[PDB]
Design an enzyme around this catalytic site. Structure first.
Site, PDB file in Angstrom:
ATOM      1  N   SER A 196     -15.305  71.219  -9.344  1.00 58.24           N
ATOM      2  CA  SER A 196     -14.598  71.324 -10.434  1.00 58.24           C
ATOM      3  C   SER A 196     -13.132  71.080 -10.177  1.00 58.24           C
ATOM      4  CB  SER A 196     -14.849  72.411 -11.420  1.00 58.24           C
ATOM      5  OG  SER A 196     -14.778  71.908 -12.987  1.00 58.24           O
ATOM      6  N   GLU A 323     -24.122  67.925 -16.047  1.00 57.82           N
ATOM      7  CA  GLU A 323     -22.881  68.459 -16.004  1.00 57.82           C
ATOM      8  C   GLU A 323     -22.021  68.689 -17.438  1.00 57.82           C
ATOM      9  OE1 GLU A 323     -21.020  69.085 -13.484  1.00 57.82           O
ATOM     10  OE2 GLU A 323     -21.491  67.739 -11.748  1.00 57.82           O
ATOM     11  N   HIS A 436     -23.101  72.441 -15.092  1.00 56.60           N
ATOM     12  CA  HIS A 436     -21.908  72.428 -14.275  1.00 56.60           C
ATOM     13  C   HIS A 436     -21.466  73.903 -13.622  1.00 56.60           C
ATOM     14  CE1 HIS A 436     -17.897  70.878 -13.237  1.00 56.60           C
ATOM     15  NE2 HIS A 436     -17.097  72.021 -13.976  1.00 56.60           N
TER      16      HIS A 436
HETATM   17  O1  LIG Z   1     -12.807  73.987 -17.222  1.00 55.35           O
HETATM   18  C1  LIG Z   1     -11.706  73.755 -18.037  1.00 55.35           C
HETATM   19  N1  LIG Z   1     -11.966  72.449 -18.512  1.00 55.35           N
HETATM   20  C2  LIG Z   1     -12.551  71.259 -18.273  1.00 55.35           C
HETATM   21  C3  LIG Z   1     -12.515  70.964 -16.851  1.00 55.35           C
HETATM   22  C4  LIG Z   1     -13.214  69.864 -16.104  1.00 55.35           C
HETATM   23  C5  LIG Z   1     -13.853  69.014 -17.118  1.00 55.35           C
HETATM   24  C6  LIG Z   1     -13.920  69.243 -18.461  1.00 55.35           C
HETATM   25  C7  LIG Z   1     -14.498  68.186 -19.712  1.00 55.35           C
HETATM   26  C8  LIG Z   1     -14.314  68.489 -20.865  1.00 55.35           C
HETATM   27  C9  LIG Z   1     -13.703  69.710 -21.177  1.00 55.35           C
HETATM   28  C10 LIG Z   1     -13.135  70.490 -20.577  1.00 55.35           C
HETATM   29  C11 LIG Z   1     -13.249  70.214 -19.121  1.00 55.35           C
HETATM   30  C12 LIG Z   1     -10.869  75.023 -18.697  1.00 55.35           C
HETATM   31  C13 LIG Z   1      -9.816  74.819 -19.706  1.00 55.35           C
HETATM   32  C14 LIG Z   1      -9.269  75.970 -20.073  1.00 55.35           C
HETATM   33  C15 LIG Z   1      -9.504  77.376 -19.513  1.00 55.35           C
HETATM   34  C16 LIG Z   1      -8.661  78.525 -20.043  1.00 55.35           C
HETATM   35  N2  LIG Z   1      -9.482  79.279 -21.268  1.00 55.35           N
HETATM   36  C17 LIG Z   1     -10.127  80.428 -20.536  1.00 55.35           C
HETATM   37  C18 LIG Z   1     -10.087  81.386 -21.571  1.00 55.35           C
HETATM   38  C19 LIG Z   1     -10.697  80.559 -22.958  1.00 55.35           C
HETATM   39  C20 LIG Z   1     -11.635  79.235 -22.687  1.00 55.35           C
HETATM   40  C21 LIG Z   1     -12.626  79.423 -22.022  1.00 55.35           C
HETATM   41  O2  LIG Z   1     -13.875  79.954 -22.622  1.00 55.35           O
HETATM   42  N3  LIG Z   1     -12.992  78.930 -20.595  1.00 55.35           N
HETATM   43  C22 LIG Z   1     -14.162  79.223 -19.916  1.00 55.35           C
HETATM   44  C23 LIG Z   1     -14.132  79.271 -18.522  1.00 55.35           C
HETATM   45  C24 LIG Z   1     -15.723  79.705 -17.783  1.00 55.35           C
HETATM   46  N4  LIG Z   1     -15.956  78.280 -17.131  1.00 55.35           N
HETATM   47  C25 LIG Z   1     -17.146  77.954 -16.364  1.00 55.35           C
HETATM   48  C26 LIG Z   1     -17.043  77.428 -15.151  1.00 55.35           C
HETATM   49  C27 LIG Z   1     -18.263  76.487 -14.822  1.00 55.35           C
HETATM   50  N5  LIG Z   1     -19.043  76.445 -15.305  1.00 55.35           N
HETATM   51  C28 LIG Z   1     -19.616  77.063 -16.569  1.00 55.35           C
HETATM   52  C29 LIG Z   1     -20.752  76.872 -17.195  1.00 55.35           C
HETATM   53  C30 LIG Z   1     -20.940  77.566 -18.527  1.00 55.35           C
HETATM   54  C31 LIG Z   1     -19.937  78.213 -19.285  1.00 55.35           C
HETATM   55  C32 LIG Z   1     -18.818  78.468 -18.309  1.00 55.35           C
HETATM   56  C33 LIG Z   1     -18.550  77.822 -17.333  1.00 55.35           C
HETATM   57  C34 LIG Z   1     -17.941  75.729 -13.558  1.00 55.35           C
HETATM   58  C35 LIG Z   1     -16.782  76.209 -12.716  1.00 55.35           C
HETATM   59  C36 LIG Z   1     -15.690  76.470 -13.083  1.00 55.35           C
HETATM   60  C37 LIG Z   1     -15.894  77.556 -14.272  1.00 55.35           C
HETATM   61  C38 LIG Z   1     -10.400  78.462 -21.898  1.00 55.35           C
HETATM   62  C39 LIG Z   1     -10.666  77.398 -18.873  1.00 55.35           C
HETATM   63  C40 LIG Z   1     -11.379  76.240 -18.329  1.00 55.35           C
END
Ligand SMILES: O=C(Nc1cccc2ccccc12)c1ccc(CN2CCC[C@H](C(=O)NCCCNc3c4c(nc5ccccc35)CCCC4)C2)cc1
Ligand SMILES: *[C@@H]1O[C@H](CO[C@@H]2O[C@@H](C)[C@@H](O)[C@@H](O)[C@@H]2O)[C@@H](O[C@@H]2O[C@H](CO)[C@@H](O)[C@H](O)[C@H]2NC(C)=O)[C@H](O)[C@H]1NC(C)=O
Ligand SMILES: *[C@@H]1O[C@H](CO[C@@H]2O[C@@H](C)[C@@H](O)[C@@H](O)[C@@H]2O)[C@@H](O[C@@H]2O[C@H](CO)[C@@H](O)[C@H](O)[C@H]2NC(C)=O)[C@H](O)[C@H]1NC(C)=O
Ligand SMILES: *[C@@H]1O[C@H](CO)[C@@H](O)[C@H](O)[C@H]1NC(C)=O
Ligand SMILES: *[C@@H]1O[C@H](CO)[C@@H](O)[C@H](O)[C@H]1NC(C)=O
Ligand SMILES: *[C@@H]1O[C@H](CO)[C@@H](O)[C@H](O)[C@H]1NC(C)=O
Ligand SMILES: *[C@@H]1O[C@H](CO)[C@@H](O)[C@H](O)[C@H]1NC(C)=O
Ligand SMILES: [Cl-]
Ligand SMILES: [Cl-]
Ligand SMILES: [Cl-]
Ligand SMILES: [Cl-]
Ligand SMILES: [Cl-]
Ligand SMILES: [Cl-]
Ligand SMILES: [Cl-]
Length: 527
Positions: A196, A323, A436
């Site tokens: 990621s 993803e 993802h």
């Molecule tokens: O990851 C973010 N952004 C994006 C990255 C890449 C492509 C994207 C495409 C479309 C939209 C967003 C994208 C992102 C943007 C802001 C933040 C800050 N806040 C944190 C607090 C509130 C809120 C939140 O609840 N964040 C959930 C974080 C857990 N996560 C998970 C993880 C993975 N898979 C998951 C699968 C199932 C469930 C969860 C998952 C893959 C490996 C990395 C971690 C956002 C965090 C993360």
């Protein structure tokens, strides 16, 4: 008692019993001056030497970050939340070395994702002890600053030049170069791998000249810099920095006085206001990310990719089958992890407004048009599956394939995989598929532990991936040469062969998502 002399002092490790053998773990080695006080928002500063024995026997603090609260008490989300104390004092790394101590071991350096706003190397699914035990490699992972504390940007202004979290990673790569030979590691054989935003990070190290001599080879799981979420524009970064200043009461005319004002703010205040700097944001918006700072990153990376301005070496690149689905339950209407999320056409259309907020009506219709040519018009999951594919193709699969084509066009070997195994222990429901981040546990060899609840077929799949990754790091070639495995062919821009990873039949296929990606790569960037 295993003690190693690093260049800044002595560190003490701990012994781990793994698979009837031993790994030596050094958890929580500092690699920079804590970025506190006057040092908040600045690039990481060199660490002044200590004289005692640093006790690297427990994971250190995770960097400050906001926490997912959408599914309290549900392991499917809470596995990604930090499991050590949050603190600005978080620039630490971990080392797993095989026992007995190796002589010139290849080194794997992990860079976690989290959208550049979250993440931490202490997560259970990033435990590099199985890699060290099974493949005799050294595994290193580091914490790096995320969110505004890691990527706030006033470009040119060193008080907040942007890209700090990337320079954290870089300073850790430097630490490995200066120190890993003392742990029995080969500084000349270093492979970066991340997933990621970590994979995007790895791809930016391929671009950054200050990193070109700090590693050998690169592995990109579900991420690359040309993904639409991966680089914040100089426009957005500035509009976001002032949005934060206004929200914190730190609006000034001297841009430096703005930073000094944000330096007297408690980390929590910066965290709460971070979320609203983006007005019309997507589910999990990358509020503060990599920018073209003129230092780590000297030009728009798309131009650098297109013009062959990157480290020439081998890459391993891949993506998962579904993803997009994880993001649908963080905002898309009619979606939910506790039902099967049959959505209507109107729900699908709202979902596009949710995921493409600043896109024109025509742009959204164009997405609907390209993804609603059903073979059967009556399958009730039609729209549900189309929304996930839209999000997955646009944010991950197509950007990764375009990276691999472009990078490989300059003469280096590239290997592309397509991970399509849904873990048997997966706590999310079935309609979300191969989500993802759920290849990571296979890369790290958690199914090799039989005391868990993985199936036998899952153990065999992980053992094969673990060998392929390790053979890629040590030898630049991700084959499994011993057990009559499918040969992983090189990915070339003409044939575009890729390898599928699954428990049943491992296959060579061509031209992943071709019809979808011509839309996303050749038409949609115009709208
Ligand atoms: O990851 C973010 N952004 C994006 C990255 C890449 C492509 C994207 C495409 C479309 C939209 C967003 C994208 C992102 C943007 C802001 C933040 C800050 N806040 C944190 C607090 C509130 C809120 C939140 O609840 N964040 C959930 C974080 C857990 N996560 C998970 C993880 C993975 N898979 C998951 C699968 C199932 C469930 C969860 C998952 C893959 C490996 C990395 C971690 C956002 C965090 C993360
Ligand atoms: C650039 O920033 C302005 C100002 O952001 C607003 O104030 C911040 C403190 C934060 O709370 C943001 O969420 C706010 O939006 C943006 O101006 C806003 O634009 C939206 C629609 O684009 C409009 O509905 C608001 O009323 C505007 N508010 C103000 C105070 O002007 C602006 O849109 C941002 N982006 C661009 C591209 O200019
Ligand atoms: C699937 O669930 C969503 C989410 O609804 C919530 O979670 C459910 C598991 C249940 O506990 C509900 O009480 C919760 O509200 C449903 O989306 C809702 O749909 C209704 C009517 O269609 C609508 O009034 C709400 O605004 C929606 N809430 C949302 C989108 O957050 C959805 O209908 C369910 N679909 C199926 C096929 O079961
Ligand atoms: C480090 O660990 C050793 C091993 O028990 C202990 O004796 C020592 O006091 C520790 N040092 C610090 C500073 O915690
Ligand atoms: C480790 O390997 C490098 C080449 O990759 C070699 O030059 C170096 O001398 C080796 N160091 C050892 C064997 O200690
Ligand atoms: C105000 O801006 C000037 C540059 O215009 C800078 O030299 C000065 O340091 C700033 N003020 C403070 C208190 O830093
Ligand atoms: C290959 O097979 C042998 C025994 O047939 C087994 O011990 C080993 O773990 C397998 N290795 C891989 C990488 O599949
Ligand atoms: Cl844990
Ligand atoms: Cl969010
Ligand atoms: Cl229809
Ligand atoms: Cl072939
Ligand atoms: Cl073909
Ligand atoms: Cl083609
Ligand atoms: Cl088209």
């Amino acid at each position: 008692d295993i003690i190693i002399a690093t260049k800044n002092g002595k560190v003490r490790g701990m012994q781990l019993t793994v698979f009837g053998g031993t790994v030596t773990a050094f958890l929580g080695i500092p690699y920079a001056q804590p970025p506190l006080g006057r040092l908040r928002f600045k690039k990481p500063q060199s660490l002044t030497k200590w004289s005692d024995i640093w006790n690297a026997t427990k994971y250190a603090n995770s960097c400050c970050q906001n926490i997912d609260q959408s599914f309290p008490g549900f392991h499917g989300s809470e596995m990604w939340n930090p499991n050590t104390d949050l603190s600005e004092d978080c620039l630490y790394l971990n080392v797993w070395i095989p026992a007995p101590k190796p002589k010139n071991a290849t080194v794997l350096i992990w860079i976690y994702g989290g959208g550049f706003q979250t993440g931490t190397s202490s997560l259970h699914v990033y435990d590099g002890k199985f890699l060290a035990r099974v493949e005799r490699v050294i595994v290193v992972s580091m914490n790096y600053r995320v969110g505004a504390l890691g990527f706030l940007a006033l470009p040119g202004n060193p008080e907040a030049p942007g890209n700090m979290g990337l320079f954290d990673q870089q300073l850790a790569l430097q630490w490995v170069q200066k120190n890993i030979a003392a742990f029995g590691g080969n500084p000349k054989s270093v492979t970066l791998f991340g997933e990621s935003a970590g994979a995007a990070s790895v791809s930016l190290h391929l671009l950054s000249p200050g990193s070109h001599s700090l590693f050998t080879r690169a592995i990109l799981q579900s991420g690359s810099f040309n993904a639409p979420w991966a680089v914040t524009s100089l426009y957005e970064a500035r509009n976001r920095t002032l949005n934060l200043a206004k929200l914190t009461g730190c609006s000034r005319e001297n841009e430096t006085e703005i930073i000094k004002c944000l330096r007297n703010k408690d980390p929590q205040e910066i965290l709460l206001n971070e979320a609203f700097v983006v007005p019309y944001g997507t589910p999990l918006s990358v509020n503060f990310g990599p920018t073209v700072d003129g230092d780590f990153l000297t030009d728009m990376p798309d131009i650098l990719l297109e013009l062959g301005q990157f480290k020439k070496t081998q890459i391993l690149v891949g993506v998962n089958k579904d993803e997009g689905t994880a993001f649908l339950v963080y905002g898309a209407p009619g979606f939910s992890k506790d039902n099967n999320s049959i959505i209507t056409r109107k729900e699908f259309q709202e979902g596009l407004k949710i995921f493409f907020p600043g896109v024109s009506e025509f742009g959204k219709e164009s997405i609907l048009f390209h993804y609603t040519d059903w073979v059967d018009d009556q399958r009730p999951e039609n729209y549900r599956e189309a929304l996930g594919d839209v999000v997955g193709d646009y944010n991950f699969i197509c950007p990764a394939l375009e990276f691999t084509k472009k990078f490989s066009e300059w003469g280096n070997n590239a290997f592309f995989y397509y991970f399509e195994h849904r873990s048997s222990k997966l706590p999310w429901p079935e309609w979300m598929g191969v989500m993802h981040g759920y290849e990571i546990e296979f890369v790290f060899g958690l199914p090799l532990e039989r005391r868990d609840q993985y199936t036998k077929a899952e153990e065999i799949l992980s053992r094969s991936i673990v060998k392929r990754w390790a053979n890629f790091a040590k030898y630049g070639n991700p084959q499994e040469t011993q057990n009559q495995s499918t040969s992983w062919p090189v990915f070339k821009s003409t044939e575009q062969k890729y390898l599928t990873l699954n428990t049943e039949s491992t296959r060579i296929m061509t031209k992943l998502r071709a019809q979808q990606c011509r839309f996303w790569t050749s038409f949609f960037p115009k709208v």
